[PDB]
Design a protein around this ligand. Structure first.
Ligand SMILES: *[C@@H]1O[C@H](CO)[C@@H](O[C@@H]2O[C@H](CO)[C@@H](O[C@@H]3O[C@H](CO[C@H]4O[C@H](CO)[C@@H](O)[C@H](O)[C@@H]4O)[C@@H](O)[C@H](O[C@H]4O[C@H](CO)[C@@H](O)[C@H](O)[C@@H]4O)[C@@H]3O)[C@H](O)[C@H]2NC(C)=O)[C@H](O)[C@H]1NC(C)=O
Ligand SMILES: *[C@@H]1O[C@H](CO)[C@@H](O[C@@H]2O[C@H](CO)[C@@H](O[C@@H]3O[C@H](CO[C@H]4O[C@H](CO)[C@@H](O)[C@H](O)[C@@H]4O)[C@@H](O)[C@H](O[C@H]4O[C@H](CO)[C@@H](O)[C@H](O)[C@@H]4O)[C@@H]3O)[C@H](O)[C@H]2NC(C)=O)[C@H](O)[C@H]1NC(C)=O
Ligand SMILES: *[C@@H]1O[C@H](CO)[C@@H](O[C@@H]2O[C@H](CO)[C@@H](O[C@@H]3O[C@H](CO[C@H]4O[C@H](CO)[C@@H](O)[C@H](O)[C@@H]4O)[C@@H](O)[C@H](O[C@H]4O[C@H](CO)[C@@H](O)[C@H](O)[C@@H]4O)[C@@H]3O)[C@H](O)[C@H]2NC(C)=O)[C@H](O)[C@H]1NC(C)=O
Ligand SMILES: *[C@@H]1O[C@H](CO)[C@@H](O[C@@H]2O[C@H](CO)[C@@H](O)[C@H](O)[C@H]2NC(C)=O)[C@H](O)[C@H]1NC(C)=O
Ligand SMILES: *[C@@H]1O[C@H](CO)[C@@H](O[C@@H]2O[C@H](CO)[C@@H](O)[C@H](O)[C@H]2NC(C)=O)[C@H](O)[C@H]1NC(C)=O
Ligand SMILES: *[C@@H]1O[C@H](CO)[C@@H](O[C@@H]2O[C@H](CO)[C@@H](O)[C@H](O)[C@H]2NC(C)=O)[C@H](O)[C@H]1NC(C)=O
Ligand SMILES: *[C@@H]1O[C@H](CO)[C@@H](O)[C@H](O)[C@H]1NC(C)=O
Ligand SMILES: *[C@@H]1O[C@H](CO)[C@@H](O)[C@H](O)[C@H]1NC(C)=O
Ligand SMILES: *[C@@H]1O[C@H](CO)[C@@H](O)[C@H](O)[C@H]1NC(C)=O
Ligand SMILES: *[C@@H]1O[C@H](CO)[C@@H](O)[C@H](O)[C@H]1NC(C)=O
Ligand SMILES: *[C@@H]1O[C@H](CO)[C@@H](O)[C@H](O)[C@H]1NC(C)=O
Ligand SMILES: *[C@@H]1O[C@H](CO)[C@@H](O)[C@H](O)[C@H]1NC(C)=O
Lengths: 91, 132, 231, 108, 231, 91, 91, 231, 132, 108, 132, 108
């Protein structure tokens, strides 16, 4: 598994993400500062310490991958992972 | 020929109200637009208000919004100006003015020209915001 | 390269990008989210004179920008306006699509001067600079950000202004701002709540500058701070 | 929506040729007017739209220009023109205009 | 979210993004085209004073732009040049890659003034603004566009100029342009072919302005229009 | 199926799309205003009314999806649909 | 197979591509002019002549595809090829 | 469209995009690289007056840009600065992300004037203009590039300055630059090493311009060139 | 020493044509470029034409394109200028001019300098476009 | 491809120091020429390329400049210089140039 | 009252070195910053150096970097200036200057104001870089 | 980090009102100083921070300004002010400043 080795580990991941009655249409829609769904998740068996270590182990390799291309705004990484996944199981 | 005359002036207390009567004759009054132009007795001209011929729009200067109200009547061939919340700078002559246009009826439907300016001016009536 | 973490029903298990894991069941691309986490949970120091030793300038590498979908509520967020001593700009302007970091408990806004020697500003330990759903490896000018990193996985408001002299060197001096003629010289140990009690006490008790000149204050080594941040 | 003329006090003798510069803050494109206010009198139209002289006025008055810089011009000054000349416009309908130029005739 | 329509051999059937349809056979990505359709087939009004009540201004939301591959031959296409009354610009300039809508039977070009109160211009009913193979949710300045929407599915020139006063309010006035001193005031009921007979009759019969001033015309409530558009 | 509920439905979809002798090389190629293939398709059993209704039902949801991202020029929607399709049948 | 028909064929493909001790972190990383891995590959049975002809046969068709879109910076071609490959074998 | 070449264990075999090849085994997207190759291996001429007959100007088509991952070490790389005779710019400025071609044995830098009639500069035979991992179909100003093409497949420094008069026509004149008052008129047959011996001999033997004016030299038809480039 | 002389002038009808002969001696004429410069008798100078030494290029002023044709002959050491479609503004003196260069032959191949200007001028010949 | 000099009529007495400003619409970078046209005579070269005096002419003529703003300068005026001075260039070969400055000697 | 005095001048050879002694009394010297300002006898003022009160920073003018060294001692209430590699332009008067501040101790911790300027000037000492 | 004053030699008689313009290359925002150097004397502070007169100096000295363009002003000139006036600043600490203006009293 992934074992945390940081000095501190905050076990409370207070998180924000993105996702009626005519709120969809942008002329009546909310401003940009209020389109964020909030939520709270607690330390369910080292999961947040696990993510805090996993983010550090993927930091350097992602930095390397971003050094290796020319796109100014990379977005297609998850799709490349899915296509790699499909080819690794069947292709 | 074409007569434009101011009336209804005098003196008034500060914070009061009065109404002017700009009567006119000698032309098709329901087809021409009318103005109001202010001149302080120590200063020059400055525009107040403008109504169109059909009473569709009303155009006001910045320093006269809300307080002053233009209206017209094409029955008695007479322009009116209702004034409220009078102040000490408003002591002036009040001109009512007729604008220029030719009426090209030779068509399927009417219409006219403008070349925006003023020709036929009244003498001006005197309005004083004071106690005497 | 770039491991995809797997939230198993027990716990978090890293998966190999070289070995084939048949235990993975991936039946959407809503099950792939790219989450960004903050450094301040790892236990780094947070105060500005203990942070901007981790920023440097360097020339001749272009920036790169990657997005991320979910983030962490930040405890500290920074914002910069650094000028060269002749008057020019140091940091590049924000491109289109760049907006500030959305949830920030405190916003350290820093302006001032420094010997800017470089074309950009990178992170010396290799972390990113999280923005509005965009991780970047530079610091764009005038846009509120945090410090942190990004991890890939399978699922199932208060403003404090500063004044900075000599921003890029090792011998730097920071100033806390109360009023535009009233400053307090920082230390390494100041927490933000202590600074909030400080401008409350200063601005209430009438000890601001009552003349044209600046007024700088020191703190004796006798007065505590108000404050693992989460206890 | 602003307009600023030449200096307000210009003096000349009878027979002179004088010009009045009128400057506009926005593009007007030939929607201007020059009004002659004799003292004790209502004003009167001289030239509408910067080109056409109104009937009844002699040919010694003329004016021209393009865009924001227009100019009224008297050909030869007459003693019957001791008056203050205004520069009005009508493009975007707040009808704002210049402050005025009083033209003094040199009589001692 | 975002349903993929399926052209079955019988008829069009919507497919679920939650349920698994085994009747779908998708053996290329040439079988996925993103088609954009026009509103004017749905039966909305088309004349400008009955259309720009559906446009408003709003501030503080960034635009978004998506592409589409095939479109419909438009009957009406619009183009805007709106200035604030002090002289500044209202609508943002067109970015690179933005070109006009390619097939347009009539192009309503509108210039003039209005109380622009906002940062952009959105569509009040939630439709898009179709451009050269790009659907956008703003109106960029000076680029000929239509109104319409976008649907996703599996497969197997004349210019009319206007003058507008008070563009953003409810009490607006439009002017038809014949010559640059010759205008006709619009109504709600005018169709474009009637306006084409109008400038033919005006420009031929010599009733334009023969002086320096403008000349505005009215239409009596006695004269019909020439014209479900497709009958 | 999809049933139209609009006021009018134009049953004639006159459509334009994009797709020799050295027309490929862009120095000899056509200008931008002539690279469009035209064509005509008639109402084959409510298909065009079906598309005109389906476009309205996907309008709001697409508007929501575009509000939920940060790409200034989204293009990858069809590829995400194809990857979702592959994962829903096998992944 | 692919047969070369060019006037000349250089059978030596001297090639450059892109791909520790804190070289990953970009503040200590190399400048832009030195991130290129070099290498040398010889003519192993007409392979380089084959690529030099294949590049000419895919030149015009790629030019056509690039004329047919609106992306200012196309990058997703290989991913479209992989998704086409997956759909052609299973989808 | 766009065939994917297959490196079989024997040799290179083109695959059909219409027929299904079961012999292909594709188990990564690291096995897909997009390689760009140079024209100078095909045997085209390389000298500038035998090359810029293949460049022309044209108006009204937007550029397109595609990337590529691996390239060939170039023997000749070009760089342009062309102005219209009134003083304006001909070629558009380089956008962000555009950098020069990285490995270049010789860099022909060309400045000067010409009747620029068009909006861009395209390649008359249909090749691309390779940049820093980006293939483009225009020539951006001031960025060192090569000429070549791109192919898709499955896997398993010296500066020479010129002066150009009349760049876009058929009756053009090029000048080799030694010193900023010392020029040599080119021919069709000059190779770069001969030009390197030429500025060595000129700059060493003291035959540059010792006055204020220019000094142009001719070469007799008696003196050979130093040099299938790879023999 | 170096002589440059104009010849072939006179008077000519409008719409006619004539040819000038700029003969020269005293130098290597096949190695130097030659000019033509116009001066109206009420005005100043203005350039007309320029040929190189080897007859490779011909450079014309804007107001003389098409109508006027430069040519040279290094046999008779003589510059020529052929003129067609003459107009009333062309009544002037016509100068033919020799430019400056040194000939650096001390090499493997020849070549020369320029410093673009003119030194040796002819007196000018007179051309009149009229009836008398 | 345009060039405009100082005003065409400059007057001075014998012994004076005078300057002639020459302005160019494009960058020329020292490809200029100053020609002395005595009346009844062919013109003659004074200074080519804005720096070098031609042989045969005395040292009282000089000139300099950088870019588009050059200036010919007479050190001390002599009575043998009643002439009109021209300012020619040769950079991009339409060979266009200024209109001329006639320098008048003050003799009653 | 407040006395600021220069001392330690004289004459010196080129390339030599000397030290000035700016002694001062009449105020809390350890709480005020001190300056050095140069004035050539044919010219005006120009700044040389500045030290803070606590000897934390040292600020030097551009033409005096490396060669000149400021130092202070709050024991003897005396400012010092060490000079090396002297040149012929350095022949001048050397001023040492006291700046302005009020000391607001009425708090939990000290601090002061600035309004950056100078009030109490010494007469200046004379330094000559020559042989006599 | 540069600063340039009014011209260095200004002459006036007793009773005159004179002004001294001081220009700064960067934005200083009221960190200026005006020093009075009598000959044979150490200089003395008049006005720090462009607004406050120092104690001991009479009210005939004043000064103001905003940003980079400040101006010292003498109300009425006295014969005890034959001195050279300097314009120093202290913003970004190279402490560079103007060259000086010597004010001459008109006594024959
Ligand atoms: C350090 O600590 C001090 C307090 O010790 C803070 O000072 C407070 O700053 C806030 C923010 O500016 C002040 O709150 C505002 O007060 C305004 C009233 O003052 C204005 O009007 C008076 C009238 O004479 C002027 O003299 C004065 O100069 C001001 O112009 C209100 O107008 C504000 O209202 C606005 O915001 C509220 C927010 O909800 C809205 O509801 C309102 O509609 C309106 O938009 C606002 O209330 C506060 O007064 C200051 N003093 C105190 C004692 O709190 C420093 O800001 C702080 N600095 C840092 C960096 O933390
Ligand atoms: C409303 O209705 C009127 C008609 O009632 C329209 O007016 C017509 O406008 C068109 C478009 O401009 C005109 O067509 C053009 O006519 C030009 C001739 O006029 C020019 O030359 C005369 C010479 O004295 C000038 O006086 C005059 O001012 C013009 O400068 C032609 O030069 C044009 O040719 C160009 O286009 C054609 C298109 O195929 C090319 O083949 C040509 O090579 C060239 O490029 C063109 O023919 C037309 O003359 C006008 N009158 C009539 C009666 O049709 C209004 O345009 C219309 N307005 C709207 C908004 O619909
Ligand atoms: C055509 O051929 C000639 C040779 O025949 C070339 O001329 C050589 O050009 C190179 C490049 O500029 C020269 O190399 C440089 O020499 C400099 C010394 O000259 C400078 O200093 C003198 C001192 O009086 C000045 O008079 C003179 O004007 C110069 O300013 C060095 O300073 C340079 O060093 C730099 O680069 C090296 C590269 O490694 C670094 O190591 C250094 O630290 C420093 O950064 C450099 O050495 C050379 O001197 C020239 N002459 C010869 C005989 O080789 C033309 O350049 C060439 N043209 C083309 C287009 O090919
Ligand atoms: C412009 O045309 C209009 C009509 O198209 C002219 O107006 C009429 O001119 C006739 C000429 O005799 C008069 O009888 C009418 O009374 C006029 N009508 C009006 C309403 O006045 C006009 O004169 C023309 N102007 C010019 C300058 O040609
Ligand atoms: C510049 O150099 C050239 C040759 O490199 C010189 O030209 C020759 O100079 C010699 C010197 O005696 C003469 O004998 C030759 O006749 C000259 N050649 C020509 C064609 O005239 C030139 O003099 C040098 N100029 C300077 C200023 O140094
Ligand atoms: C500004 O406030 C400070 C203190 O907050 C004042 O300084 C003190 O003022 C009192 C008033 O009698 C004096 O007794 C003290 O000696 C002062 N302290 C110092 C260090 O001088 C100051 O006077 C106030 N200034 C203004 C203009 O209001
Ligand atoms: C800061 O860095 C400089 C660079 O050499 C060094 O001289 C100085 O001593 C350093 N100071 C500290 C406090 O590290
Ligand atoms: C500080 O802010 C106040 C607020 O209005 C302003 O009046 C004052 O001029 C400011 N002072 C400085 C030095 O910026
Ligand atoms: C337009 O809106 C304003 C805003 O209140 C309102 O006062 C006015 O009556 C409205 N006019 C019409 C015709 O709807
Ligand atoms: C209208 O257009 C004509 C066409 O040349 C032009 O001459 C005239 O000045 C224009 N008038 C206005 C008011 O723009
Ligand atoms: C170049 O093209 C022009 C265009 O017609 C032609 O007149 C000329 O003869 C051509 N010259 C050569 C050498 O091809
Ligand atoms: C040529 O370059 C040298 C190098 O310094 C320079 O001094 C000279 O002025 C240059 N000449 C021209 C004509 O640019």
């Amino acid at each position: 598994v992934i074992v945390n080795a940081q000095p501190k580990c905050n076990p409370n991941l207070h998180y924000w993400t993105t996702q009626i009655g005519l709120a969809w249409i942008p002329y009546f829609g909310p401003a940009a500062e209020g389109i964020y769904t909030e939520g709270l998740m607690h330390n369910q068996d080292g999961l947040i310490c696990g993510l805090r270590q996993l983010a550090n182990e993927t930091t350097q390799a992602l930095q390397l991958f971003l050094r290796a291309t020319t796109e100014l705004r990379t977005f297609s990484i998850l799709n490349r992972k899915a296509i790699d996944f499909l080819l690794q199981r069947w292709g | 020929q074409v007569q434009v005359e101011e009336s209804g002036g005098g003196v008034v207390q500060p914070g009061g109200s009065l109404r002017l009567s700009c009567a006119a004759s000698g032309f098709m009054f329901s087809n021409y637009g009318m103005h109001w132009v202010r001149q302080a007795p120590g200063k020059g001209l400055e525009w107040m208000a403008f109504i169109r011929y059909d009473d569709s729009k009303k155009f006001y200067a910045d320093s006269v919004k809300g307080r002053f109200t233009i209206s017209r009547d094409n029955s008695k061939n007479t322009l009116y100006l209702q004034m409220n919340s009078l102040r000490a700078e408003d002591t002036a002559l009040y001109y009512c003015a007729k604008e220029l246009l030719q009426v090209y009826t030779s068509a399927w439907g009417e219409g006219h020209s403008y070349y925006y300016a003023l020709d036929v001016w009244g003498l001006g009536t005197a309005v004083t915001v004071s106690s005497a | 390269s770039i491991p995809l973490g797997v939230i198993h029903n027990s716990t978090l298990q890293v998966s190999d990008v070289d070995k084939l894991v048949c235990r993975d069941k991936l039946s959407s691309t809503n099950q792939l989210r790219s989450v960004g986490l903050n450094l301040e949970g790892n236990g780094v120091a947070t105060d500005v004179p203990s942070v901007t030793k981790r920023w440097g300038f360097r020339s001749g590498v272009p920036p790169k920008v990657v997005n991320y979908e979910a983030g962490e509520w930040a405890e500290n967020c920074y914002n910069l306006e650094i000028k060269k001593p002749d008057g020019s700009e140091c940091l590049p302007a924000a491109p289109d699509g760049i907006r500030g970091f959305p949830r920030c408990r405190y916003v350290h806004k820093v302006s001032g001067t420094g010997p800017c020697a470089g074309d950009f500003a990178f992170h010396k330990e290799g972390a990113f600079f999280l923005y509005d759903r965009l991780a970047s490896t530079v610091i764009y000018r005038g846009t509120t950000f945090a410090e942190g990193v990004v991890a890939f996985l399978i699922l199932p408001s208060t403003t404090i202004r500063y004044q900075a002299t000599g921003f890029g060197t090792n011998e730097t001096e920071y100033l806390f701002e109360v009023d535009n003629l009233t400053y307090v010289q920082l230390e390494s140990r100041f927490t933000p709540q202590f600074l909030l009690q400080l401008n409350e006490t200063i601005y209430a008790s009438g000890k601001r500058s009552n003349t044209t000149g600046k007024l700088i204050w020191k703190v004796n080594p006798e007065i505590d701070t108000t404050i693992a941040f989460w206890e | 929506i602003q307009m600023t003329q030449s200096p307000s006090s210009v003096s000349a003798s009878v027979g002179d040729r004088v010009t009045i510069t009128c400057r506009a803050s926005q593009d007007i494109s030939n929607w201007l007017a020059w009004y002659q206010q004799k003292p004790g009198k209502a004003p009167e139209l001289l030239i509408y739209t910067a080109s056409i002289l109104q009937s009844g006025v002699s040919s010694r008055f003329s004016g021209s220009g393009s865009g924001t810089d227009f100019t009224l011009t008297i050909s030869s000054l007459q003693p019957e023109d001791s008056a203050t000349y205004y520069c009005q416009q009508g493009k975007s309908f707040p009808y704002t205009f210049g402050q005025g130029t009083k033209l003094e005739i040199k009589r001692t």
